[PDB]
Structures are given as structure tokens and as C-alpha cells.
Amino acid sequence: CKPNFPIGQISENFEKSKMAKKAKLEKRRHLRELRMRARQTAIQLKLNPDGTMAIDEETMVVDRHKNASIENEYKEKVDENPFANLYNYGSYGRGSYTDPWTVEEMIKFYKALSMWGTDFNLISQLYPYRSRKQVKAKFVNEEKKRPILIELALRSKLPPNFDEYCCEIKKNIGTVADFNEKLIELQNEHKHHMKEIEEAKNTAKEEDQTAQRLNDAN
């Protein structure tokens, strides 16, 4: 009589335990498909015959809840099973599940590690929905996994096998603009608006002292 799972006596109130387990397996599988798809109110008046051009006293104030209650009515209703809320040490702590890496990604990983030394800033956006933290750990775990395949990369101090010319420009064809001077030209616009509001600042200041000096005379 092995110690794992005999069905063997009364076992009162196990059904609420049963479909909770079948729902938690269903919940995690819908978290998989978010990943697979991502890889890819003024005031109102009226015109009475008695008093024309009269404004409504109820539109003067706002309720601040009728707008909220519309969407809250159109939310999904579910019945809470107090078994479903279970929590462990793995709760309310940052960190998630990393989507494991493929060999199609490695040719964009080795070559991006072949061109530069080790630069985690620009390779992050190359893997568009991966973040800066776990890709740094992908450099670390490969030191124990493939120590010799990495050791060919820093010996390579030359332009590599000339196939990165597409991936040189595939990075560049996103938002084609001369970024070495695109940032300069609109920054000069920004200080122009700040200078104009600074002109608006002092010209508001000088007329104000001019006006109340006349009130000081009278």
C-alpha cells in the first residue's frame, strides 16, 4: 500500500478540494498564451418658456460613481472558493518564469556577443519583450554550461563572418532618422519654448508692477 494516493475511505468534503486543483491547472495554461501571442461632462442648461437661459442645478454637481458603476456591472462574476486563495512562500515576491531559449535565438545571441565585448544595454531591445535582468543571467549560466563556446568569442577581435550586414541594418530600419542630430534639433525647440514662456514671465511681471503703482498713487 504505497504512501502516494490510495482512495480508501470516507474522505468527507473533498469535492471542493477537487475542482480547485483542476482550476489551478487551467489558470496557468492561460498564462502560457499571453506569452505565445506576445512573441509574434460639462455643465448643461436649457431654455424654459418661463425662465429662459436657466442652468440645471443637478448638472452643476457630478456624482463620480455612475461612470464607475457602468464598467463594474460589466465585469465577470465568480464565486470564491476559500480553498482557491492558498498562498505559500512563493507569493508576493518579484520574479517570474523565464521563457526558455531557442537555438534560433542563439545566432542572434552569439553574434551580438561576437560584435561587442559584453554590452547588455542594446541587446535587450533585440529580444523585444525580454528584460535587462534575466538576459544578464543568461550570460552567467552559460559560463558553466558552455565555457568553451564562449571562449571563442573574445579571441575573435575582428569583423566576423560577413553576415551581420542585414542585422546591422535590421536594427537601423526601425524609425529611420539621423539620431545623432535628431535629438539636437528638437532639444533646441524645447529651450525656445522655455525662453518664450520666460519672455511671457517677465512681461507679465512688468505690467503688474506698473498697474498697482497706479493704485498706490490713487
Next chain:
Amino acid sequence: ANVTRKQEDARRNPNPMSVKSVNDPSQNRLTGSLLAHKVADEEANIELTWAEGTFEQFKDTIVKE
């Protein structure tokens, strides 16, 4: 007679600006019986033409069973 008497009293010595507000759940608003006086003061009159008929309605009941 007195609504003119108060109006002249203002113009002898007249001695001297609306943005929205928010419904609060710790405040009351006027309702009930005085709200019926707030809607009984300004509404559409109808000028009745007072007549004297009384035979048109009379036979209207006779023909109906």
C-alpha cells in the same frame, strides 16, 4: 404687494463665479416635500377656455354599454 416692497429695498442700498462640485457620501441634499415646492413654482400654465357643454358627454355614455 410685498414682492415689490422687497425689490425696492434692495435698490436703495445695493451692497455687492460658479464651478462644478462633487457628490459626497457624507452630505445630504434637499428632497421630499420641499422639492415638490421646487417643481410647483416654475412649470407650464395652460389657459383654460371655460365652457358649458354637458350634452356631448351625456349621450357619449348612453351609446356605450
